[PDB]
Design an enzyme around this catalytic site. Structure first.
Site, short mmCIF file in Angstrom:
data_model
loop_
_atom_site.label_atom_id
_atom_site.label_comp_id
_atom_site.label_asym_id
_atom_site.label_seq_id
_atom_site.Cartn_x
_atom_site.Cartn_y
_atom_site.Cartn_z
N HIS A 179 -12.53 -13.37 3.36
CA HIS A 179 -13.56 -12.54 2.90
C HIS A 179 -15.18 -13.13 2.76
CE1 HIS A 179 -10.78 -8.74 2.18
NE2 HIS A 179 -10.82 -9.24 3.27
N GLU B 173 -10.50 -12.55 -1.87
CA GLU B 173 -9.94 -13.16 -0.72
C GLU B 173 -10.38 -14.26 -0.03
OE1 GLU B 173 -7.81 -10.65 2.24
OE2 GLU B 173 -8.75 -11.78 3.61
N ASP C 75 -6.23 -13.40 -3.46
CA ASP C 75 -5.58 -13.24 -1.96
C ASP C 75 -5.87 -14.54 -1.32
OD1 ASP C 75 -4.73 -10.60 -2.41
OD2 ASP C 75 -6.28 -9.73 -1.18
N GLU D 20 -11.45 -5.54 -4.75
CA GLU D 20 -11.15 -6.49 -3.54
C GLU D 20 -12.61 -6.42 -2.73
OE1 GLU D 20 -7.66 -6.83 -1.40
OE2 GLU D 20 -8.86 -7.23 0.40
N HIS E 294 0.78 -1.26 0.06
CA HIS E 294 0.00 0.04 0.04
C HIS E 294 1.01 1.32 -0.10
CE1 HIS E 294 -2.48 -2.97 2.39
NE2 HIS E 294 -3.52 -2.40 1.95
N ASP F 225 2.78 1.82 3.27
CA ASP F 225 3.60 0.73 4.07
C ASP F 225 4.94 1.12 3.49
OD1 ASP F 225 1.59 -0.93 4.68
OD2 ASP F 225 1.48 -2.02 2.84
N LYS G 208 -15.28 -7.31 0.44
CA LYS G 208 -15.34 -7.89 1.74
C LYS G 208 -16.84 -7.56 2.52
CE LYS G 208 -12.80 -7.72 6.05
NZ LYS G 208 -11.81 -7.12 6.85
N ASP H 27 -7.42 -13.91 9.16
CA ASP H 27 -5.98 -13.64 8.43
C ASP H 27 -5.18 -14.88 8.61
OD1 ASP H 27 -6.47 -11.59 6.62
OD2 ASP H 27 -6.03 -10.29 8.24
N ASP I 162 -2.39 -12.69 1.67
CA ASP I 162 -2.75 -11.48 2.71
C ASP I 162 -3.29 -12.27 3.85
OD1 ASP I 162 -3.77 -9.34 3.91
OD2 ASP I 162 -4.79 -8.60 1.96
N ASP J 193 -12.35 -11.11 10.71
CA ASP J 193 -11.41 -11.66 9.77
C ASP J 193 -10.09 -12.10 10.45
OD1 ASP J 193 -10.07 -12.25 7.15
OD2 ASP J 193 -9.45 -9.89 6.95
N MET K 69 1.69 -6.10 -7.89
CA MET K 69 0.72 -5.60 -7.59
C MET K 69 0.82 -4.49 -6.48
SD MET K 69 -1.80 -5.39 -4.79
CE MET K 69 -2.15 -6.70 -3.89
#
Lengths: 388, 388, 388, 388
Positions: free
Chosen positions: D220, D217, D245, D181, D54, D57, D183, D257, D287, D255, D88
């Site tokens: 998600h 994802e 993802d 994306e 991102h 980041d 969610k 992860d 992810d 979520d 990406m």
């Protein structure tokens, strides 16, 4: 026809609710920190009865005994100036990285011992401030993977911890009771004692069961798709409803902590009906978070909303129960027969009763309608204020 | 490396599983009815240990005492010819329209009395056939609306019913125990005693708690999004796991009753690991339904699959626990410390222990990794048979 | 302040709703079958606008062309005698065992062809009766296991089926449109086109997209934990809301089919607000099942409840939107700015606009409260009729 | 039989995954921040193909153009020294308090404009670094209450934003595509474009649909209880699977992860089978978040686990499809017939075909078993490596 709360309504708020800065897993804080003293004063103006706290909300973690005494004095003065009470207190055994694998059930023994000392220290403070209930929410007691935690050993450690706390309270001659707060998940993948039922069952294995009850939360049970009013009835039936946390939740997902009344509105109606009918006299505590979209004016509007919604629902439930048409519908649905013993005549009489089996007309009984839909529409009309 | 079951594995099936005709809420039956005798013979050929039944599976509802004796004799002969046992039996208090509002907690008193007589009659039959456990699944005890059922009164009626059954069993000198089967919902909107925890808590309020345990089902707890292995550990911890129902479920939705192993595969692995580690010696009962897409050959393949999957998982769990690398990982994650008392030294010693608070280095403890991910990947490798 | 429906309100019911006998997966029917003619007459007395049907509700499966004409004539006469309309019709491609693996996406080709012929036959009947919408609910299109269905091939078969139906309708010069009804699961483990979004996306791949829309159901989307009003807004945004099914559902579990208003009450309020604000002029169709606890008087009370609840919510939503205090709160929350283009000035202008980035005060913008809680409490007060 | 990844496997990780400090809604960070350069080097040693980011980041929010160029240069050097790619990139439109009500759909217009400029700036950077896909996750586009967001207006604003981004990309002659994306919820109560289907449908309304696809994802879709492999098949069917993802999720809750392979293991098997069978050639992006219980050694073990699990599943799926016994079972279940057109002969031929209706033996067709259980047990045996 307004709904103004007064301290007699026993509405309480945790310092951490109205004080939530707005930091969530995907974003930074949206509001500045609130001084506990300010919260006490604002809540008192709204009509609250009292506040609750985790040790770390009141005394910043790592504070010296000097600063500690200073924070308590300031808080005390705020309580004295407003008339606010502090009926419940609890320990923060979840924020600090040291509790990443739990407090009472951490795999590391030294962490478990530290958890007990941190709790005991705050129990003393709670009594000093007049708290009658001490809540324990094991938010970090659990796991994300199967082999990380032997649940039987963890339950042994959980019982050991609560048994020691019970011994301490008894030895000090304190007049305070414990309430276990269950939650099915979040922040752990699965949390131990996930629902009201698991907590009730666990309590029966403690050395002094009479010292422990439950502190159920609306949103928590709803995260498991359970009927909150039903769970509360079971806790009441067992005589274990020592405290209750009110908020709103929209189904099975992360814990939303919406203001009370939001989320499942009909469940809120049925909860209020039950609490009032059963004569629950403990605090009506709100553990919620004003959404991070709000500024401080939104925070207070959200807090006031909690109380307002409870009072509107109370009015509607009372009118529902007081309505003769509803009283007749309850009889039509045989709620009166549900309250009568099935066989007060005894086992032998039941076995000898031919009308109970040999001569029972199963087809006639089966054809009787329960009339539950008309009753429910009467409940709906009352909730919506559409009775005519 | 095959996995053939033998009666010593204690795998049992309900007559209603393999005998399910395929009728669901949106469709008609896809398979013809199976004669119980045929089921007993087919299951015996597959390596099963025994079968279970609801009264109505064995004896068509409304049968005369003459036909009744005839159905039992035929069944007995099948059991004698195959060596199959019947370790558990239960009552059907849910199919007949008369139980539309429940059996033990129906609002109608006369229905509740009929429910008790129907149950008692089948308890006698169960003992005659050698059943050691009598299961009770209150599938109709519940509600779709809030005012239809006062839960406190319903729990009074539930306790009354179980107390009477306990009195009957004791008075007859029967050697049989009861197991309550919880379920959160379906066919009712919400069912009373919705999870293992609620059932355990309820049992502690019965007059003779020692006569009652739980009969948890994989799919049931998963319908509330709960961790099944965790719930089973709590039941074991309390010494209440009298029986267990195995099947597969894919999340929170209608009860799928998929064959065991299907659904949440890792949860199945962890369940088997726990049952075997804890020495559970009761039956491994399958309460599942072969999908209605299948013909009879698919029914038997589905039943054989249940047993096969349990045996594969048993092998993998045993290898996981026996692996020295895993044993070292368990120590690295401190599972050994979890099993050690937190304060066998006592309360006073803990309070005087400066290493537990005043001199405890919270930052050093917090920095220790739990090493849970490596342990879990070792569990995954073992499950998948990818260890090298 | 009463709420009596009139045919102008466009409330419709499926013959199968009020006609549901009460058979569920765990129990037998609790009510006798209703003659379609009787249903038409009873519904007309309650104020309904019309009825809908699956071919098999009106004409018993396997009927001769003679009996078929007889059933239609009787039904026609009932419609003529009451003034009731039939705005929608659909096919039953789920009850008969032949559709156990689907209709349009069955693995067996001969079944798929039969499914199309059965549908086409009922399309002719629907037009004859004046239906403007033809609904398709693929309740059996799906699977319980992964290898049983190649989803890409199944979607090819689904498109082929709808494309052929579109060709037929066009070739016959019929004035009728199709509406796809999504559902995430039940009776299949997972159903194809599980939500409104999947159905909308699928439609864009059909040869003649303009002939197809969606027929969303409250309970269906709620079975996936989705926000129904949000999904309806997207369907409206795309101009695809051809029909809508109203009922009640309490969270993620089996499809309850509770009367409209029951289940998530606030979602029902927001749905009504949206439908009325957007000017949806199609039927307000109820696809629900009066609980099996009820006798026939309970069936009609349940049906009347659906309409009553919609009308109460309509009144409350209208008052909410018409309230000046609410209109000011909407502005305070910037709903007015949401409706204004972000960059009607164009891309280049946006890139050159220093107030949009280089000189944008991110901290001042971040400090603005959204005032969403006050707005929501105003919505709550209006719903509960507590405005003062 | 090991499973070592190589850059040819196309496994990628987001900087924020392995770099997650452990801060959750109830606790502080448990790990120190990772320098992006260090992550690139560690991931390269594990066998990764590339990383994603991102904007925030890589470049701390509020950085000067000077510091910005410095951070990029350091990162570039790390990529050059390791051979790692960056396929990406995406924008962080969710962390900063300014996006508390959204980015592209914030009610405040000035925020929406800022959101577009922040995105455009990072699109330039993404192209410079060689990214082929630009992901957009509208984590803040949504609401906690009904009146806070008019969804139709919000979708207008969403389309406006994506249309402008498409115009920019085209005008600059960039070779980059967008992937939305979806969610369903978290951090907002309900998020717009909640599932893969909603995102696919939305894309068809954009001005240049060919420039947009989806980035689904695992976790998600599973938060809505949906079948991930099914959703991926629909995206593939539409030719819109631009990126994916991978992670693990245990049902409907927050979520999690979890590393890929954890969570629903069978769904992971079926996903891998589909991706490989369909020839998906994009990145296999993870992810996920290594649990906060872990130290840095646990972080890398968790990341390595993701890749290892994908490779084991790939091997098992390939063996399943290559097994002659499975190929025969697929025919027995008629997967071959599913792939054949239902009516390549055309509409008229179908209507005239008496074997399709008038002379179709519905009872013989209905009696055919689908043999799905045997097929599924073969899939299970292959997954577990128990084939013999």
């Amino acid at each position: 026809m307004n709904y103004q709360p007064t301290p007699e309504d026993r509405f309480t708020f945790g310092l951490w609710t109205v004080g939530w800065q707005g930091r969530d897993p995907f974003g930074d804080a949206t509001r500045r920190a609130l001084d506990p003293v300010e919260s006490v004063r604002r809540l008192a103006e709204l009509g609250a009865h009292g506040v609750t706290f985790h040790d770390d909300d009141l005394i910043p973690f790592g504070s010296s005994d000097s600063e500690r005494e200073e924070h308590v004095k300031r808080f005390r003065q705020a309580l004295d100036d407003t008339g606010m009470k502090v009926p419940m207190a609890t320990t923060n055994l979840f924020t600090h990285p040291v509790f990443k694998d739990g407090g009472f059930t951490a795999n590391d023994r030294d962490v478990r011992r530290y958890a007990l000392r941190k709790t005991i220290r705050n129990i003393d403070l709670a009594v000093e401030l007049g708290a009658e209930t001490y809540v324990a929410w094991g938010g970090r007691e659990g796991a994300e993977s199967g082999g990380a935690k032997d649940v039987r050993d963890a339950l042994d450690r959980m019982k050991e911890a609560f048994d020691l706390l019970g011994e301490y309270v008894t030895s000090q001659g304190y007049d305070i009771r414990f309430a276990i707060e269950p939650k099915p998940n979040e922040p752990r993948g699965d949390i131990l004692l996930p629902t009201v039922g698991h907590a009730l069952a666990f309590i029966e294995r403690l050395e002094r069961p009479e010292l422990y009850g439950v502190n159920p939360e609306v949103g928590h049970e709803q995260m498991a798709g359970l009927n909150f009013p039903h769970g509360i009835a079971q806790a009441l039936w067992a005589g274990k409803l020592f405290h209750i946390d009110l908020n709103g939740q929209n189904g099975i997902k992360y814990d939303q902590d919406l203001r009370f009344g939001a989320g499942d509105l009909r469940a809120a109606f049925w909860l209020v009906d039950l609490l009032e009918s059963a004569g629950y006299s403990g605090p009506r505590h709100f553990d919620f978070k004003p959404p991070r979209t709000e500024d401080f004016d939104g925070v207070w509007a959200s807090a006031a909303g909690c109380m307002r919604n409870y009072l509107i629902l109370k009015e509607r439930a009372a009118a529902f129960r007081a309505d003769p048409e509803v009283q007749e519908a309850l009889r039509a649905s045989r709620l009166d027969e549900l309250a009568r013993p099935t066989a007060a005549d005894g086992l032998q009489a039941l076995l000898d009763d031919r009308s109970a089996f040999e001569e029972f007309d199963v087809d006639a009984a089966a054809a009787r309608g329960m009339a539950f839909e008309r009753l429910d529409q009467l409940a709906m009309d009352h909730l919506l204020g559409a009775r005519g």
